[PDB]
Design a binder for this molecule. Structure first.
Ligand code: HEM
Ligand SMILES: CC(C)CCC[C@@H](C)[C@H]1CC[C@H]2[C@@H]3CC=C4C[C@@H](OC(=O)CCC(=O)O)CC[C@]4(C)[C@H]3CC[C@]12C
Ligand SMILES: CC(C)CCC[C@@H](C)[C@H]1CC[C@H]2[C@@H]3CC=C4C[C@@H](OC(=O)CCC(=O)O)CC[C@]4(C)[C@H]3CC[C@]12C
Ligand SMILES: CC(C)CCC[C@@H](C)[C@H]1CC[C@H]2[C@@H]3CC=C4C[C@@H](OC(=O)CCC(=O)O)CC[C@]4(C)[C@H]3CC[C@]12C
Ligand SMILES: CC(C)CCC[C@@H](C)[C@H]1CC[C@H]2[C@@H]3CC=C4C[C@@H](OC(=O)CCC(=O)O)CC[C@]4(C)[C@H]3CC[C@]12C
Ligand SMILES: CC(C)CCC[C@@H](C)[C@H]1CC[C@H]2[C@@H]3CC=C4C[C@@H](OC(=O)CCC(=O)O)CC[C@]4(C)[C@H]3CC[C@]12C
Ligand SMILES: CC(C)CCC[C@@H](C)[C@H]1CC[C@H]2[C@@H]3CC=C4C[C@@H](OC(=O)CCC(=O)O)CC[C@]4(C)[C@H]3CC[C@]12C
Ligand SMILES: N[C@@H](CCC(=O)N[C@@H](CS)C(=O)NCC(=O)O)C(=O)O
Ligand SMILES: N[C@@H](CCC(=O)N[C@@H](CS)C(=O)NCC(=O)O)C(=O)O
Ligand SMILES: N[C@@H](CCC(=O)N[C@@H](CS)C(=O)NCC(=O)O)C(=O)O
Ligand SMILES: N[C@@H](CCC(=O)N[C@@H](CS)C(=O)NCC(=O)O)C(=O)O
Lengths: 591, 591
């Protein structure tokens, strides 16, 4: 009693996992599946008993008909039970085929749960962890839980149960010494298998690691084809690749040899047990203590026990690795940040459109605070701009306005309504934003510009395309609206991406339009046509913008200049030139 | 005789493949391995004969000692042959362990051959094919050839051979009707397996394709986390993912059910054959025509035949897919471009350093020729520049100078030496070039700036680092020279990349230094320090450059302006301003 209470709640949670909590018929499928597994374990003893009975009736003179009937019964059981390999039988195969429905339900439920829980985390969690490996953890976790349940319920517990049935049949119906032989032989076999597998796993993991390094050495060398052509180094690249190959062979040989040693040890143990049992059984049956078929029964029973026990090592490794992998996935599932939550849940009301700041500090980086009590306010229809010395402070201002991160000390309200207790669905309904640079994922134009809401209609979406004028390029595409777009599809322009963005935010029709402008190269005339479209979508809508151009500065109804989280200049475009602060110096460098 | 002559030369080439053409002992290993395979096929008949002999001596009254000796011999053969037919016995396992050396030689040779042949192709071939899939073809080809040889030599030919031995043993030593039963049963079994597998492969491939699509729908949705957070579409993303899951289940169920049907058909056929054989054998042995152990012999022989024949379907699929995959790899191996080759092989001599052009046209794009008879010449030490209206013509001029592509009509010589018959090793020895933007692959600084030649020494490479002044940033790294660098390693600056480039070309010490400048953002003072380093490495060296800045234009000793492959302006910086062509207009827009 050392490792008992730790595994209990985890095994209880997995016990909750396999049983469908609400499904009507799936639980019946589970019960009938376990019933078939039990009946197959019955067949594993009831076949060779009939074999002994056949050879007993044959070895003495018997009538033809009764012997024929029992032979038919024997070959019938050799059909219902598997011919060999604990599979290939009308009972185990029907168990597998009838089992395949519940695995679908289990996999779908667990994997959709983990997918929703990845989309519920906050932004700050994702920027820390490498996104290229969380995916692997989740996928391997789902495959791990289905594999672990399948293996450890249907191919390890039945085998050990069959060992126990075996020791009992021999002890109760044969001499005790036969039970001693089978017991000692199978216990020794299991102990040798366990020890050698836990020794061999080191070579296994070292081989895998070196394999992933050698393959990478090559993909990169071919991809940098241009550089290796430059520097006249083909022979050097080939030689270094050969060295990586040689090291990989030097590990793989060790792994394969260890496998052979394990296999030969197992075979020797079963052969030794078979020799002892066959000799002793022969001695009794030639001393008239037993019957002729008992030797045949013992031979076929040892072979029948050995055939599924041969695959014990790989089950042991796979249960170990999926167990630790489920532990990692379960750890990630319990991990949770969700900074934006309040149980009061008072959704936002839109009545004016006033954006007011009140003395808020902020530190997404630890220690270095990037906000010193900035405070301003706007009226409905007001257009604000934010330009100053280079820094991510304005971008963080937008992101904290969007309830990505949290205020540190202070509060920001919209229309005098505190944003702390508002549901985020209500907030992201009221707000809308064209970003830095949009990313358009692999789909057609039609649904991707329908993406602004679920209920987007066809007439509405062609109406919005006419509103923001993509239709010329859309007809310039081969099939038009059904054009496949993305990394799989066609490459587009950054101006086209901003056109997509203004289309989908038109479809959203937000209260306040936020903008975040990039340094994408475009001619000024088309840039200002896009600016006119943004001006008309923000017409009678309050607007906060970051800008980099002179017109995009001078359009401001309330400019603001900040650096390192503090307000330094304010007013308008003409007033700050007459003031001649850093605005006047920056304006000459924008020429 | 329809598909005989087509397979002959391919099978002859694979016959050349397995046999090592020069190795002394590997051929001996191959012969001893085939000898062990033959002896194992002998054991597969010699075991159950002894089983029948044991039960025959047991069923009559026999002395203890002789029976004990033959029982020991039987269990001994059950050790040498697999306890369970398959790879579980000393005769076969030693074959696998002793075989593992020749597979290393085969895999290393074929995969290094294909790697060298990918590095021998020209540049124009790579820009056409997607590089993201040639890699898959090569890797799967090498794994295909080793798998195909292993499967089709060691687990299909032996099984069919064992079937033939079986029909003969029964026909020659038993009644002819037993041979008829085993023949008809195994022929029917093979035909059913073949037909059902070739029917099932459709569901297999459809399941794989839908699987790769569903997974991709998810990785992209998580990666665009920011956009899906913007547009308030978590529930929509989850729902669309659930639809993809449901379609995937709707295919996977069909595949699994087809597998179950195949397995049950196989088991039913073997069970039916076993029933017919056991009944008829029982009738003869109760009519005194045979001996008691003949029933036992037939039962164990049918089980021994069935146990390896159960795995026929997956061998059939895997031989089919690796066969077509080896065909693809072999097609790619025979594919070859190698535009730069002449058997005369007259290497370049460097005596002056004069670069002369003589009336050459060029068309890397078909039809649209991008070179109209450009011709000029330089003296040793001359510095040339190439700036004009935007176009890839200058870049192609450098690339054709480097013997990437070919001249179309005309010739270009260096120092009056024709570059057509020069060996490319001689050319790339004499020439050196700093490129557009270098790529530095995953290694340390030390060998990556040693990369300019194989014989790079430690004192030389620290000397070159002192020469080009990276040493301050190198000590600014954590451990200094052993810093791991790349995508795995640290990110660096573009100026640092150009420093690496000037270091490795210093180490090369070429005749003519070519440069190709990018639009990387850098301050002018450090840019001109880098320019001074390039000026001193090209000091007393002829130089051809593309430029974008005023100083990088006015340094030219012989300027040249081209557009769409034709020469339009020439002279120097001052002369073309006085001429006032497109040079004067472009110079005002460079301000
Ligand atoms: C889903 C679980 C399984 C996996 C992942 C698996 C994996 C593999 C793989 C990758 C091979 C190719 C040969 C190799 O890699 O050396 C293979 C072959 C084989 N598997 Fe499985 N297998 C599984 C289930 C089973 C079961 C249940 C059995 C029967 C007890 C079995 C018996 C075999 C046999 C006899 C071979 C051929 C060995 C040879 O040709 O040398 N496998 N398996
Ligand atoms: C979930 C798993 C662990 C269930 C395992 C079930 C076994 C522990 C038991 C339950 C029913 C038992 C069977 C019940 C009846 C029979 C028939 C019996 O055949 C006879 O000839 C007995 C009657 C007689 O004396 O005539 C031989 C044992 C056997 C197969 C028993 C073998 C052991 C079995 C399979
Ligand atoms: C459903 C498909 C797969 C066909 C399955 C057929 C079997 C169920 C048949 C075929 C051969 C039959 C056997 C053929 C001959 C005999 C001898 C026969 O002997 C007598 O009738 C004794 C003399 C008498 O009383 O007339 C008893 C039935 C038996 C064992 C038969 C039992 C039923 C068997 C196994
Ligand atoms: C390494 C693994 C395979 C275990 C091997 C153990 C055997 C070497 C041992 C354990 C059980 C022993 C047997 C247990 C009981 C008996 C019965 C015993 O019988 C009598 O004493 C009288 C018999 C009679 O009068 O008929 C003779 C020794 C013998 C065969 C023993 C011989 C040696 C055996 C087979
Ligand atoms: C697949 C390729 C490599 C061909 C493989 C051929 C073997 C499968 C054959 C060839 C010769 C055969 C043997 C020829 C003669 C005998 C003796 C035969 O009887 C005896 O052992 C003694 C008989 C007597 O007393 O005369 C048992 C089968 C055996 C070993 C045969 C087993 C199968 C063998 C090895
Ligand atoms: C190498 C390691 C794995 C040990 C292997 C041991 C076997 C080779 C031994 C152990 C038991 C032995 C058997 C034990 C008893 C007998 C009875 C013995 O009967 C006699 O006739 C002997 C006495 C006499 O001469 O009258 C003949 C040898 C035999 C079969 C022995 C043959 C050799 C065996 C199988
Ligand atoms: C579906 C697959 C598994 C094929 C099944 C074929 C059987 C239904 C056939 C083929 C071989 C036939 C046997 C071939 C030869 C004989 C011996 C023949 O013997 C005699 O004529 C006299 C025997 C004597 O006097 O001892 C009786 C019929 C029988 C058993 C035949 C019965 C029907 C068999 C088993
Ligand atoms: N949460 C996703 C994860 C999907 C996933 O991880 N897919 C694999 C390919 S089958 C992958 O891209 N692995 C990440 C890697 O190892 O690069 C899911 O389970 O659907
Ligand atoms: N009999 C051995 C091996 C049985 C076997 O055939 N397993 C195969 C897999 S199908 C194996 O070990 N291959 C290497 C691996 O799985 O890593 C054991 O005790 O596990
Ligand atoms: N020629 C290389 C090719 C290596 C290769 O193709 N590796 C695989 C991974 S095992 C890869 O790059 N896959 C790319 C992909 O799947 O897109 C070799 O055989 O060593
Ligand atoms: N008995 C079946 C299957 C035998 C078997 O165990 N094969 C496994 C692979 S280890 C299988 O079919 N798995 C599914 C697959 O390979 O697609 C046959 O006729 O091939």
């Amino acid at each position: 009693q050392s490792t008992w209470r730790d595994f209990g709640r985890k095994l209880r949670l997995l016990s909750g996992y396999l049983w469908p909590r609400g499904s009507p018929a799936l639980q019946l499928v589970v019960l009938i599946c376990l019933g078939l597994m039990g009946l197959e374990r019955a067949l594993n003893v009831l076949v060779p008993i009939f074999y002994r009975n056949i050879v007993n009736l044959l070895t003495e003179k018997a009538p033809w008909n009764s012997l024929a009937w029992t032979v038919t019964s024997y070959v019938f059981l050799k059909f219902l039970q598997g011919g060999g390999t604990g599979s290939t039988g009308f009972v185990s195969n029907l168990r597998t085929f009838l089992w395949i429905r519940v695995q679908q339900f289990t996999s779908r439920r667990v994997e959709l749960l983990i997918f929703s829980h990845l989309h519920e985390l906050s932004l700050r969690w994702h920027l820390g962890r490498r996104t290229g490996e969380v995916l692997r953890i989740a996928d391997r976790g789902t495959s791990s839980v289905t594999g672990l349940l399948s293996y450890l319920v249907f191919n390890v517990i039945p085998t050990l149960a069959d060992i126990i049935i075996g020791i009992i049949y021999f002890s109760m119906f044969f001499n005790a010494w036969f039970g001693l032989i089978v017991f000692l032989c199978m216990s020794l076999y299991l102990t040798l298998t366990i020890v050698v597998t836990e020794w061999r796993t080191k070579f296994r993991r070292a081989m895998n690691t070196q394999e992933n390094a050698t393959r990478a050495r090559a993909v990169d060398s071919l991809l940098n084809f241009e550089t290796v052509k430059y520097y006249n180094a083909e022979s050097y690249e080939v030689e270094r690749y050969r060295e990586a190959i040689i090291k990989y062979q030097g590990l793989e040989w060790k792994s394969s040899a260890s496998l052979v040693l394990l296999n030969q040890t197992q075979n020797l143990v079963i052969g030794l047990g078979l020799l002892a049992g066959s000799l002793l059984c022969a001695y009794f049956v030639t001393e008239q203590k037993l019957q002729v078929g008992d030797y045949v029964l013992f031979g076929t029973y040892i072979i029948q026990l050995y055939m599924p026990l041969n695959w014990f090592g790989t089950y042991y490794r796979m249960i170990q690795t999926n167990f630790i992998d489920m532990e990692n996935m379960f750890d990630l599932l319990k991990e949770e940040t969700e900074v934006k939550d309040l149980p009061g849940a008072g959704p936002l009301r839109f009545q004016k459109g006033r954006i007011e700041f009140e003395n808020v500090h902020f530190s997404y980086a630890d220690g270095r605070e990037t906000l010193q009590d900035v405070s301003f306010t706007v009226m409905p229809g007001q257009t604000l701009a934010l330009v100053g010395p280079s820094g991510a402070g304005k971008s963080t201002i937008l992101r904290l306005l969007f309830r990505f991160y949290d205020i540190s000390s202070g509060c920001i309200r919209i229309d005098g309504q505190d944003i702390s207790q508002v549901t985020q669905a209500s907030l992201r309904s009221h707000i809308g934003v064209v970003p830095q640079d949009t990313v358009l994922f692999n789909d057609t134009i039609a649904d991707n510009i329908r993406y602004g809401r679920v209920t987007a209609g066809n007439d509405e979406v062609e109406a919005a395309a006419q509103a923001a004028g993509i239709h010329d390029a859309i007809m310039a595409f081969p099939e038009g609206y059904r054009t496949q777009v993305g990394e799989r599809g066609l490459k587009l322009s950054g101006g086209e991406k901003q056109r997509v963005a203004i289309a989908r935010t038109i479809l959203k029709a937000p209260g306040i339009i936020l903008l975040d402008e990039a340094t994408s190269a475009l001619d000024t005339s088309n840039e200002r046509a896009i600016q006119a479209s943004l001006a008309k979508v923000c017409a009678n809508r309050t607007t906060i913008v970051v800008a980099h151009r002179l017109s995009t500065v001078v359009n401001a109804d309330q400019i603001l200049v900040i650096k390192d989280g503090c307000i330094v200049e304010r007013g308008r475009h003409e007033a700050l030139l007459s003031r001649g602060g850093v605005y006047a110096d920056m304006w000459q460098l924008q020429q």
